[PDB]
Design a protein around this ligand. Structure first.
Ligand code: CU
Ligand code: CU
Ligand code: NA
Ligand code: NA
Lengths: 619, 619
């Protein structure tokens, strides 16, 4: 059967053919998003119905459509015309990458700005930047990109070293019109190159690094069946891939003795946003929803053995649609491997004389994406002891500006005249929970300090408290690192051998959440990012914390809308949405290419098992 | 030549000779501590002056002695008699491990307590548990241990499974008296065994783990010279070992071009304490200073190839003193190795067409110690990009009690009738800073949110602020995870090429600090544990946050007394003391042997370098 299998080339071609046959994919049409939908709750007991969801753009100016197709049955389930002024523009198209530059290169206003700075238009790269929603009334219902310029001295030059500050332009990418060109004044274009492969800058390459060789002479300890079903050290799951979210994990479960015990039904990064903290009008509008606006899966890198993924690696090569509905594979886009993870457990007992040491390991499922200047690695880990973890690795080249004469409270200096505006990278992990099945609840757990006094005469006692989140109205929670705050997802109907509800505990990093003023456009569009933890009642159309159409879309959709339904979440099918991010004040060490920095979260079993689940691990 | 070399067997024998000779080491004397002192500031000018410090106990009842010896010249530099009521009792002796059990075995009150519960005295283990300072006037200036009992059913049995609750004893070790026996009532002794090598409990061992082979066919990239001097990937340091602190790192420096740039003069874990949060009088006194009371260095494990340390491992075997002054080797007690650490930096540029990926690695220096039921791994990491990290890995067997009928706010259930009292493990890292030399200062850095309004019309701006800690009275700081609080150690007189002071940024995990009421004995004796970050002016006698003699010292010693001098720390030779720990509410999964959990901290360069320090890493 495998209803959770990866989309195949054939299914994508078949979706193309069904849309063509239905008159929904003529020559003016482009696919902005296409993805398989998950099986309905209660299916499987039913025969397969592989359904695909598609967002269709029209290059002639007609309204776009949202369409669901049954590839199994050869039918259109639903097709609806979108009013983008109301519900949002479609994601940025790959084919739009060059359009902002191209339109600007023959615009008199743009040419005058470049001439004022003695810049050859043929050398000026313009990034295709999402526009957001600000004060420009003509943009409402128009497909707009904003353009920031970077000089490329020659084909292999890193243009990020040479930002053109004081200049921004706005462009209607459908009508092919430049709507505005703003020039607030010339800034020096920083002169130093940032070519990290140029020997003049790297100096002589190190010869001190002796090889490290990681092999598995008997092959890996996991199996892959049905294309994407993994079995490893009692874990079971399906590795999905979506052009928006990237790698998605389905049906995470753990085989405890004879019983396959569900833990998480679906795990994904459902949004990620990069808000900038520079109040210059040149960049004060910039907030990049890498997931919702750009689609991180579509820009997943092909990962090279040795370089990207080291050891004995099993790759998946997910298939996506191009703009015309033809299938296109991302060769070696997903890495899967197990790695040693140091000591699992150890004790040398004085009274028994028994010395005991065991090694840990983890299964790693990862991909790496590139969104303009940024490159991110998304890593999911499963450990022997039942721990589940996510880690993002952020690297690439920092987004640059001029560094103002006399400094800046909102920009860092990286090189002479070269700045890097402050920003955050903020993720939302959507964890559709299934702790021992779907009947789940969430408690907030704080450490409780106790006063010295009767019953605690020495003032040493400390405790904890748990507060059940009973309805969605009560389920928008903030971190409290000082009181060791965590959140436990339990099954109130499933008890361990000590008669306590089985559970998993989410441990957050307690990094700063969204810093923008609460009255800002970004605080509304990225409302999710203002709070660390949200809990909703599962619904099949509540997929993204920002809604389906983020591009140039105001508040009105996403998590705040979902939570208003105030649904019962106390022993129901629920979804946890955890916000976590990095706050980046760039350092000189980040330039000219950034060393990886990290953020994430993990969930650990909390009386899920009846004792340590790793007593059967051999020496 | 190396003044920071490890103590050799010969040095310890030479120290032993000096003591016995001058009438300090007869049959009634026992060495409770011995170690090499670090050289004085600026001693590199003059010839070597190797001194050792010794604490000497007397089993007859005579006053203990602190003694400094010069091994290089064969003299006693000083020898002072200690008043222990005033300055503290000496560290627990290895040879006292069984004395509490033996003294109780012949005691009528104790035997009555055992007979009422039908426990065979030959099967009752009693732990030698540190006493602290409470309400018992008789104990002032006396060497006291407390006893808690655990039943061992046979030689190979884990006694931790069988706590005898409701029962505690106090013991004068020197005069061999039993001062008190408290029996608050019988609790059932939990019956299930906790023998994690018993096939009945483990079930059949897994056969699913295929090997992972990590080799270096050209050997490692680090060199070791003069016994303990490491050079690896631009790093330079010396690996010391002390019987109290364990592994100590000296002279951490980085070769930037042709200059050896100091970063940290000395790094150690200078204290670690395990306070318990159960108000039962049976345990409410218990607070185990594993470092200051027990000495974690002397209980360092011999680490086995393939089991404890995997890959190409270079070992050090530190030598320490036994109770009589003979050198005793800890074979393979320190592991040193490099390991792969994923992606270092990656960018695939749309405009330049250049794809770039580099791999990270880290140097690992570790040891593993065992303190009764606890086992801890202490790991220091140096990364290619200049990051320095410490991680503690906590494992072993949880300290147990009965689980009360009708539950507990201060104890977790692990098995039928078996409890685990809540507790913390709180570490203090003492970082004697030398950022580009000794003239340093510390700033507290908070993220700063900005209000929407003039100068920030879109309400997107955010910033940061830095507050210099100018004097020790202002230098006792708490975490604020919400505002992204960090601490930067800089050198105001050393500027990078952008004319900004060079610095390193300390990133804490912001876990809870000491939870005990501020009026408790443990808040006084482990005052360091109540705050996240302390900065003092360097003094050669200020080595530990809890003082030189922790055992039965009344409050206030160490950091609170040091900070009270209120010295200048703004551009001076300073020391950072970072408190960090684990708050442990034991889970069923921790039983019968606990999977590793971790805590730590890191420091990253912050304008220390003129650009990324890893551009010369090869593909
Ligand atoms: Cu960043
Ligand atoms: Cu613990
Ligand atoms: Na759910
Ligand atoms: Na210092």
């Amino acid at each position: 059967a495998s209803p959770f299998r990866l989309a195949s080339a054939g299914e994508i071609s078949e979706v193309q053919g069904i849309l063509r046959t239905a008159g929904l994919l003529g020559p003016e049409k482009r696919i902005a998003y296409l993805g398989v939908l998950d099986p309905a709750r209660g299916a499987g007991s039913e025969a397969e119905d592989r359904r695909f969801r598609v967002f269709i753009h029209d290059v002639s100016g007609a309204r776009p459509q949202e369409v669901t197709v049954s590839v199994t049955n050869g039918t259109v389930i639903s097709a609806v015309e979108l009013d983008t002024a109301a519900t949002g523009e479609l994601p940025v198209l790959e084919e739009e990458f060059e359009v902002v530059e191209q339109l600007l290169a023959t615009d008199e206003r743009w040419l005058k700005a470049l001439a004022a700075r003695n810049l050859d238009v043929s050398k000026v790269r313009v990034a295709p930047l999402s526009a957001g929603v600000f004060e420009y009334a003509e943009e409402r219902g128009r497909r707009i990109l904003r353009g920031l310029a970077f000089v490329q001295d020659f084909p292999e030059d890193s243009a990020w070293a040479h930002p053109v500050d004081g200049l921004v332009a706005y462009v209607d990418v459908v009508s092919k019109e430049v709507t505005r060109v703003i020039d607030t004044g010339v800034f020096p274009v920083p002169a130093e190159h940032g070519n990290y492969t140029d020997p003049e800058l790297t100096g002589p390459l190190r010869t001190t690094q002796k090889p490290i060789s990681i092999t598995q002479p008997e092959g890996p300890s996991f199996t892959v069946t049905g294309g994407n079903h993994i079995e490893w050290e009692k874990w079971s799951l399906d590795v999905g891939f979506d052009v928006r979210e990237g790698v998605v994990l389905h049906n995470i479960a753990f085989r405890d003795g004879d019983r396959l015990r569900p833990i998480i039904n679906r795990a994904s990064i459902a949004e990620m946003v990069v808000p900038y903290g520079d109040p210059s009008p040149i960049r004060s509008w910039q907030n990049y929803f890498d997931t919702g606006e750009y689609l991180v899966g579509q820009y997943a890198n092909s990962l090279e053995l040795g370089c990207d993924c080291l050891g004995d690696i099993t790759y998946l090569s997910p298939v996506i649609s191009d703009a015309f509905g033809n299938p296109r594979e991302i060769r070696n886009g997903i890495c899967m491997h197990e790695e040693d993870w140091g000591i699992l457990a150890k004790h040398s007992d004085l009274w028994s004389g028994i010395n005991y040491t065991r090694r840990n390991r983890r299964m790693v499922i990862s991909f790496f994406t590139t969104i303009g200047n940024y490159d991110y690695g998304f890593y999911w880990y499963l450990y022997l002891d039942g721990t589940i973890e996510f880690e993002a690795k952020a690297t690439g080249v920092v987004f640059t500006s001029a560094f103002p004469e006399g400094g800046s409270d909102n920009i860092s200096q990286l090189a002479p005249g070269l700045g890097a505006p402050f920003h955050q990278h903020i993720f939302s992990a959507r964890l559709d929970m299934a702790i021992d099945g779907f009947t789940n609840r969430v408690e907030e757990e704080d450490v409780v300090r106790q006063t010295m006094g009767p019953g605690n005469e020495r003032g040493n006692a400390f405790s904890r408290k748990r507060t059940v989140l009973t309805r969605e109205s009560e389920a928008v929670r903030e971190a409290d690192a000082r009181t060791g705050r965590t959140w436990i997802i339990s099954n109130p109907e499933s008890k361990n051998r000590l008669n306590e509800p089985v559970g998993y505990k989410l441990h957050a990093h307690n990094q700063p959440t969204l810093l923008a003023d609460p009255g800002s456009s970004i605080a509304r569009r990225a409302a999710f990012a203002t709070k660390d933890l949200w809990v909703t009642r599962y619904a099949d159309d509540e997929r993204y914390p920002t809604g389906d159409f983020v591009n140039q879309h105001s508040g009105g959709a996403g998590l705040p809308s979902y939570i208003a339904q105030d649904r019962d979440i106390d022993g129901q099918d629920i979804v946890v949405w955890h916000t976590f991010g990095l706050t980046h004040f760039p350092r000189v060490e980040d330039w000219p290419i950034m060393p990886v920095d990290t953020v994430g979260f993990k969930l650990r079993p909390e009386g899920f098992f009846d004792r340590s689940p790793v007593l059967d691990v051999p020496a």
